């Protein structure tokens, strides 16, 4: 609702991308270099920017406008760190051929679609534009399907958009937050498309719902190692091995951590802990940051961290514009 939550959401995502990418590129050292504080953003922010700029330009989801903005952003800087798969979608959208803008995503991976976390890494803007939980699901799905036609991909984008949507409503028990997400994901993973996509990849049925139940079990435990978190939830490029991990980091870091100095606020702790899991740290931290930012607001975004991030001024402009146009 508040401008502070909109600004905190997009700043938190930007910090996750910039700080997470810094760690993914360079092998107590983490805590030292964050206190030290330009950090460049990656494809996570480039695509989040294009998604938000599309929503502002059309004052609504427009699949053609958003597809064009994704393709143009890619053409302008193809080296930001895109998944090797998704670049095929941008190259199709850039060529002059007459097509349905959703067709390149559908053709990915022998027509099964991408289950990568790229649909989820950029989706937070949907939950700033659309207040209704039905619209959040509908437009998180459609925005994701421009690149990610697999339900294993777009259900991760829906889960991340729902987590941001819930975080914007403010103070919640971890139990209430998790139950709400589990209710939606058990519904979505029971859909024929979700069942079919899971089985055609030789996967467990209901990967999101299973990981959300494991999050509840992990949060109930007195202590859990990073190895156990990564073993159970993942830290990878697949949406189902990163989106629940981001949500775990958000829920876990509502409590202080004996291993993270008490000088760090809850938002900073969430980002530090998510990066400590390793793997696809840019994308896990951008998603944990979006949720934490929406929840804690701009008061917990440290100015020294925000001002170290490439494009933080434009991110703040876009948060304020979303608030004006849609709120």
């Amino acid at each position: 609702s508040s401008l502070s939550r909109f600004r905190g959401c997009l700043a938190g995502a930007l910090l996750g991308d910039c700080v997470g990418s810094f760690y993914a590129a360079h092998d107590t050292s983490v805590l030292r270099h964050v206190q030290s504080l330009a950090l460049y953003y990656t494809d996570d922010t480039a695509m989040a920017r294009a998604l938000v700029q599309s929503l502002l330009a059309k004052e609504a989801f427009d699949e053609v406008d958003m597809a064009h903005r994704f393709a143009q952003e890619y053409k302008k800087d193809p080296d930001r760190g895109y998944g090797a798969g998704v670049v095929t979608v941008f190259k199709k959208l850039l060529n002059p051929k007459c097509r349905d803008v959703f067709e390149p995503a559908r053709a990915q991976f022998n027509g099964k679609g991408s289950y990568g976390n790229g649909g989820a890494m950029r989706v937070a803007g949907i939950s700033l534009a659309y207040s209704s939980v039905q619209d959040v699901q509908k437009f998180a799905r459609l925005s994701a399907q421009l690149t990610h036609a697999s339900s294993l991909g777009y259900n991760g984008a829906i889960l991340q958009a729902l987590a941001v949507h819930l975080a914007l409503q403010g103070e919640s028990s971890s139990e209430h937050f998790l139950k709400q997400l589990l209710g939606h994901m058990e519904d979505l993973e029971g859909d024929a498309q979700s069942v079919l996509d899971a089985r055609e990849l030789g996967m467990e049925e209901r990967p999101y719902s299973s990981r959300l139940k494991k999050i509840g079990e992990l949060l109930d435990q007195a202590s859990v190692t990073r190895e156990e978190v990564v073993s159970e939830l993942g830290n990878g490029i697949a949406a189902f091995e990163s989106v629940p991990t981001a949500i775990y980091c958000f829920l876990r870091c509502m409590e202080p951590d004996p291993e993270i100095p008490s000088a760090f606020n809850s938002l900073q702790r969430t980002l530090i802990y998510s990066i400590s899991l390793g793997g696809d740290t840019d994308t896990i931290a951008t998603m944990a940051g979006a949720i934490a930012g929406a929840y804690y607001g701009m008061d917990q975004v440290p100015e020294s961290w925000q001002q170290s991030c490439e494009g933080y001024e434009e991110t703040d402009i876009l948060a304020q514009s979303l608030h004006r146009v849609f709120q």
Binding site: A24, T42, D43, G81, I237, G279, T283
Partner: peptide, 8 residues
């Protein structure tokens, strides 16, 4: 791969 990061 474990992650995606821009090239060195």
């Amino acid at each position: 791969p474990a992650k995606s990061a821009p090239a060195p």
